[PDB]
Design a protein around this motif. Structure first.
Motif, mmCIF file in Angstrom:
data_model
loop_
_atom_site.group_PDB
_atom_site.id
_atom_site.type_symbol
_atom_site.label_atom_id
_atom_site.label_comp_id
_atom_site.label_asym_id
_atom_site.label_seq_id
_atom_site.Cartn_x
_atom_site.Cartn_y
_atom_site.Cartn_z
ATOM 1 N N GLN B 123 1.502 -1.016 0.077
ATOM 2 C CA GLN B 123 -0.594 0.163 -0.294
ATOM 3 C C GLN B 123 0.877 0.878 -0.080
ATOM 4 O O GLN B 123 1.850 1.337 1.075
ATOM 5 C CB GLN B 123 -1.119 -0.370 1.119
ATOM 6 N N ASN B 142 -0.262 7.937 10.771
ATOM 7 C CA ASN B 142 -2.708 7.669 9.837
ATOM 8 C C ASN B 142 -1.439 6.129 9.158
ATOM 9 O O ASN B 142 -1.950 5.261 8.705
ATOM 10 C CB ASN B 142 -2.362 7.878 8.268
ATOM 11 N N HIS B 143 0.184 5.894 8.703
ATOM 12 C CA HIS B 143 0.985 4.594 8.695
ATOM 13 C C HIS B 143 0.365 3.953 10.005
ATOM 14 O O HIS B 143 0.315 3.039 8.986
ATOM 15 C CB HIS B 143 2.025 5.292 7.526
ATOM 16 N N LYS B 145 -0.977 3.057 11.869
ATOM 17 C CA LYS B 145 -2.602 2.850 12.320
ATOM 18 C C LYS B 145 -2.846 1.638 11.471
ATOM 19 O O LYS B 145 -3.387 0.918 10.982
ATOM 20 C CB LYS B 145 -3.376 3.875 12.404
ATOM 21 N N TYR B 146 -2.832 1.739 9.928
ATOM 22 C CA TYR B 146 -2.934 1.145 8.710
ATOM 23 C C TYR B 146 -2.160 -0.021 8.578
ATOM 24 O O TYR B 146 -3.128 -1.272 9.099
ATOM 25 C CB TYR B 146 -3.475 2.015 7.406
ATOM 26 N N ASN B 149 -3.447 -2.178 11.688
ATOM 27 C CA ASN B 149 -4.056 -3.176 11.772
ATOM 28 C C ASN B 149 -4.794 -4.313 12.442
ATOM 29 O O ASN B 149 -5.116 -4.775 11.912
ATOM 30 C CB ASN B 149 -4.458 -3.638 10.215
ATOM 31 N N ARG B 154 -0.045 -5.032 7.517
ATOM 32 C CA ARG B 154 -0.514 -4.720 6.217
ATOM 33 C C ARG B 154 0.475 -3.963 5.769
ATOM 34 O O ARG B 154 0.921 -2.990 6.722
ATOM 35 C CB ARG B 154 -1.585 -4.143 5.780
#
Ligand code: HEM
Ligand code: HEM
Ligand SMILES: Cc1cc(N)nc2cc(-c3cccc(CN)c3)c(F)cc12
Ligand SMILES: Cc1cc(N)nc2cc(-c3cccc(CN)c3)c(F)cc12
Ligand SMILES: C[C@H](O)[C@H](O)[C@H]1CNc2nc(N)[nH]c(=O)c2N1
Ligand SMILES: C[C@H](O)[C@H](O)[C@H]1CNc2nc(N)[nH]c(=O)c2N1
Ligand SMILES: [Zn+2]
Lengths: 415, 415
Positions: B123, B142-143, B145-146, B149, B154
Motif C-alpha cells: 500500500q 496514519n501509516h 494505524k493502517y 491493522n 499490512r
C-alpha cells in the motif's frame, strides 16, 4: 588497494593489503557477485610449458623471501636452476622444503576453511616416489595411523606424484579416506549415507562385497599413474569411531549412531608453483557442526531430525514450534560430548570461530590480510551468536592453493 | 550472460537473464569479492540535470512495457513530457501510478529482503504534498494505524517530497518509527536497547523527557524541507506491543520482555527514475528471528542469553555445552508463540525461507531472475536446515531501489 574490513560486534577495523598479491580470479564482476555459487568455474581444474616459469618464479620469490633470503645467490641460482629444468623437461621438481612450504600455504590460503589458525603445524608426508596402487594404499594407511594418533588428532597431508602429461595421473577416487556407504532401497529410501550412493555402487562395480548396513566404511579406490583404480580395505583397527550418546537423554544411544574421528578429504587438487598434484589427501579434526548439523540433518544426508524430535516428545505439527531447531541443538550437544568423553579431538563452532577471528588478527598483522569466505566461514547453526557472523571478510584467491577437480570416473580414459 | 544458479538440496536449476538489465555496481571485481561488506560504498547515497533523463527514460520504458503499452503514443508523449519538464525545471514529477510502480519494484529489487514474495501487495501513501514536521507526524501516524491493522499487519510505505536542491530535504531521523530507547548507566552497562544509545541522547538533546526505563518507545524526530527536526510522541494506543511468554516455561514471563509489532524502517532512501526520496518509511511484519535472535541476543543489543540460560538451569561453564544455542531456540519459540497468541502477524524463519524459494521460482520464470544476497537471506539461526542455505543466489543491483544514506545529524547544516 588498501581496503578495510570492519567487525560490527566489536567495532574492530582491519586493513587488507594482501589482496594486492592476488593472482587468480573470483567469478564476480563490477555488476555481479557470485559469492554464493558453490563450485564456481574458477575453483576447478592442464598447463603448457610457457606459463610455467612465471608461476615457479612467483612461488620461489615468496619462498626465499620467507626464510629471510630474498634475492640472494641461493635464490638466483634456484631460479636459474628451475628455469633450466623447465627448459630441459618442460616441468620441474620441488625441493622437500619447498613442498612443505607450498602445502602449508595452500591451507593458509583456503578462504573457506575456519580451522586455519593451525596452518603452520601441518605434517607433510612426501609420497612422490610412489608408483602403484598398493604403494598408495600403504602411504594412506600410514597417514591414517599418524593423523589419528589414538584420538589425539594431528593434521597431515600426503602428496603423490604431480601431474605431468595428464594421462598418467594419481587419483584417490574416494571423496574422503573414511566415508560411510550409501545404499538405495527397493522402496527408494536410502540406508547409510545418501551422499555416497553413486560412489558406493562404483565400488560394487569394481567388485566390492558390501555388508549393506548403515555405517559401513567404504573401501579405498586408488588410481596410480593413470592405471585403472584398485580396491583396498583400510584395516579396521586404524579406523577410529565414536558412538554418539547424550549427557541427559538415555534414549539417545538407542538411535545407534556413530561417526568416524578423522576428516580427511582426498578428492581435491594441490597447486604449487604451477605444478598440479591430483592426489593429496589432507586431514585435520572435526568441528562438531560438520557431523551433527550437515552430516546428520541435511535433507539429502542421514536426515535424523524427525526421529530425534519424536523421542524428544516435540510439537511436530507446526513449523513454528521450532521443533527442528530444538532437536538440532541436542544432536550437536551429543556429538561434542561423545567425542570428548572418548578423548577424540573435536572443536565446537563457538571455539573454532573465536579462534578464526584470533587468526584473522594475526594474518592482517604479519601478512597484511586473510582471504576469507563468509558464506562458508559462518557455521551452519547459530550463526549470529558466533563472532564470525559480524566480521566482514574479503575473499580473494591466493596461491599455493587447493582447488576442486572433476571426479575421475567421468574423465578417465578407461580400459 | 545466461548464468545458472543451482539448488543443492533439490538439484533444481534456474537460469538468470535478468542480471543483464543491471545498471548499478556491486563493489566486487574479478580479483575480489566484497559480498560480506555490510554497507558497501555503492549501497549509499547528489545528481545533476544531465544524467536525469536516461534515468527517467530507463524507468518509463519498464513502466509502460509492464502495463502492455510499450513504445505506444502514450509512452512517447510521456517521454517527451518528462524530457520537457527536465528541460524546464531540471527535475520532474512522477504520476501517482508511476510512484506506486516504482515503490513496489524498489522492494522487489531489494536483494537482502527475504519477504519479497509479497512485493506486489504494498500500500503506497503519497505524502508528496507535505510541508511541515507536524504534517509528517500526521502522515506517519496514519501509516502506523493502517499498517498495524489491529495486529493483522499490512505492508505500506509513505513517500515524502523528493530531494531537489539537497539543502531542503525531508528526513525521518529515527532509524525506525517504533524503537526502544537506550540509556547508558553510571557503571557503563546499558538499560534499554544499546543500538539506539546515540539517538536516545539526541532526543534528550532536543528536549525529550525520558522515562528512563527498559522498553520506552522513542519519540519521532521529523525534519521537513531542510528545517531543524521536531519531536512528536506517537499516541500510545497506536503502538501495538507483544509481551513475550513461553508455552512451557512459566518463569519466562518474569523476564518482563516485550517487543513492538510493527517493523517500519525510516532511515533509507528510495530512488525512482533518478529521483531521490530521502524520507520514505516502509513497514511489513516481523520474521521471528529479527527479534529473538538479533534484537534479544546480539552482544551489542539486549543480550539476554545468559539470564535465559540461568533460569533454564544450563551447563554454562563449557562453551561446548551449547548452552548458548540451547537458550537461543527457547527465546525464539517464545517470540513466535507470543505474537501468535496475540494475533499479531509474525512469520518463522522456516516458513519465510520456504516462501522465498517459492518466490525465486516465480521471478526466474516471469522476470528471468531474482537478485538475492545469500549473506542476508540465510536466517541468523539454524541456517542449513532452511532451504535457502542450499540455494545458490546471484546478487546484482537493479533500479528502482532502496539505498542507505548517512545519518542527518552528521550531514545537516544546522541552526
Ligand atoms: C585442523 C582442523 C581443521 C578444522 C577444524 C577445519 C574446519 C573446516 C570446515 C568446517 C570447513 C568447511 C567444511 C564443510 O563445510 O564441509 C573446512 C574447509 C576446508 N578446509 Fe579446513 N579444517 C581443518 C583442517 C584443514 C587442513 C589440515 C586442511 C588442508 C591441508 C584444510 C583445508 C580445507 C579446505 C581446502 C577447505 C574448503 C575447500 C573449498 O571448498 O574451497 N582444513 N575446514
Ligand atoms: C512483508 C513482511 C516482510 C518481512 C517478513 C521482511 C523480512 C526482512 C528481513 C528479515 C530482512 C533482513 C533484516 C535484518 O536482518 O535486519 C529484510 C531486509 C530488507 N527489507 Fe524486507 N521484510 C518485509 C517487508 C518489507 C517491505 C514492505 C519492504 C520495503 C517496502 C522491505 C524492504 C527491505 C529492505 C530494503 C531490506 C534490506 C536493505 C538493505 O540492507 O539493502 N521489506 N526484510
Ligand atoms: C581437513 C578438514 C578438516 C575438517 N574438520 N573439515 C574439512 C572439510 C573439508 C571440506 C571442504 C569442502 C567440501 C567438503 C565436503 N565434501 C569438505 C575439507 F576439504 C577438509 C577438512
Ligand atoms: C519492512 C521490513 C520488515 C521486516 N520484517 N524487516 C525489515 C528489516 C529491515 C532492515 C534492513 C536493513 C537493516 C535493518 C536493521 N537496522 C533492518 C528493513 F529495512 C525493513 C524491514
Ligand atoms: C559482517 C556481515 O556482513 C554482517 O554482520 C551482516 C551479515 N548478515 C546479515 N544478515 C542479516 N539478515 N542481517 C544482518 O544484519 C547481517 N549482518
Ligand atoms: C548455496 C551455497 O553456496 C551452499 O549451500 C554452501 C553455503 N555455505 C556452506 N558453508 C559450508 N561450510 N559448507 C557448505 O557446504 C556450504 N554450502
Ligand atoms: Zn563478490
Amino acid at each position: 588497494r588498501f581496503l578495510k574490513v570492519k567487525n560490527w560486534e566489536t567495532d574492530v577495523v582491519l586493513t587488507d593489503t594482501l589482496h594486492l598479491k592476488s593472482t587468480l580470479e573470483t567469478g564476480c564482476t563490477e555488476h555481479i557477485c557470485m559469492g554464493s555459487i558453490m563450485l564456481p568455474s574458477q575453483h576447478t581444474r592442464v598447463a603448457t610449458k610457457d606459463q610455467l616459469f612465471p608461476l615457479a618464479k612467483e612461488f620461489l620469490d615468496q619462498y626465499y623471501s620467507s626464510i629471510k633470503r630474498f634475492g640472494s645467490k641461493a635464490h638466483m641460482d634456484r631460479l636459474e636452476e628451475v628455469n633450466k629444468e623447465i627448459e630441459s623437461t618442460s616441468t620441474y621438481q620441488l625441493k622437500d622444503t619447498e613442498l612443505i612450504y607450498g602445502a602449508k600455504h595452500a591451507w593458509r590460503n583456503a578462504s573457506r576453511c575456519v580451522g586455519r589458525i593451525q596452518w603452520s603445524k601441518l605434517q607433510v608426508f612426501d609420497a612422490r616416489d610412489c608408483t602403484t596402487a598398493h604403494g598408495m594404499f600403504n602411504y594412506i594407511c600410514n597417514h591414517v595411523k599418524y593423523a589419528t594418533n589414538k584420538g589425539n588428532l594431528r593434521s597431515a597431508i600426503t602428496i603423490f606424484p604431480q601431474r605431468t602429461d595428464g594421462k598418467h595421473d594419481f587419483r584417490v577416487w574416494n571423496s574422503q579416506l573414511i566415508r560411510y556407504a550409501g545404499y538405495k532401497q527397493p522402496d527408494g529410501s536410502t540406508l547409510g549415507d545418501p551422499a555416497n550412493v553413486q560412489f558406493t555402487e562404483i565400488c560394487i562395480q569394481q567388485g566390492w562385497k558390501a555388508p549393506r548396513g548403515r555405517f559401513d566404511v567404504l573401501p579405498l579406490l586408488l588410481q596410480a599413474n593413470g592405471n585403472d583404480p584398485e580396491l583396498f580395505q583400510i584395516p579396521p583397527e586404524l579406523v577410529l569411531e565414536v558412538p554418539i550418546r547424550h549427557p541427559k537423554f538415555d534414549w539417545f544411544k538407542d538411535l545407534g549412531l556413530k561417526w568416524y574421528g578423522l576428516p580427511a578429504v582426498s578428492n581435491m587438487l594441490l597447486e604449487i608453483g604451477g605444478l598440479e598434484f591430483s592426489a593429496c589427501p589432507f586431514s585435520g579434526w572435526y568441528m562438531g557442526t560438520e557431523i551433527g548439523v550437515r552430516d546428520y540433518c541435511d535433507n539429502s544426508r542421514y536426515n535424523i531430525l524427525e526421529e530425534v524430535a519424536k523421542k524428544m516428545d516435540l510439537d511436530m505439527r507446526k513449523t513454528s514450534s521450532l521443533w527442528k531447531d530444538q532437536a538440532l541443538v541436542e544432536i550437536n550437544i551429543a556429538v561434542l560430548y561423545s567425542f570428548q568423553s572418548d578423548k577424540v579431538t573435536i572443536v565446537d563452532h563457538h571455539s573454532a570461530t573465536e579462534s578464526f577471528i584470533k587468526h584473522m588478527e594475526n594474518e592482517y598483522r604479519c601478512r597484511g590480510g586473510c582471504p576469507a569466505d563468509w558464506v562458508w566461514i559462518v557455521p551452519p547453526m547459530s550463526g549470529s551468536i558466533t563472532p564470525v557472523f559480524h566480521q566482514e571478510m574479503l575473499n580473494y584467491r591466493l596461491t599455493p592453493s587447493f582447488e576442486y577437480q572433476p571426479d575421475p570416473w567421468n574423465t578417465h580414459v578407461w580400459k
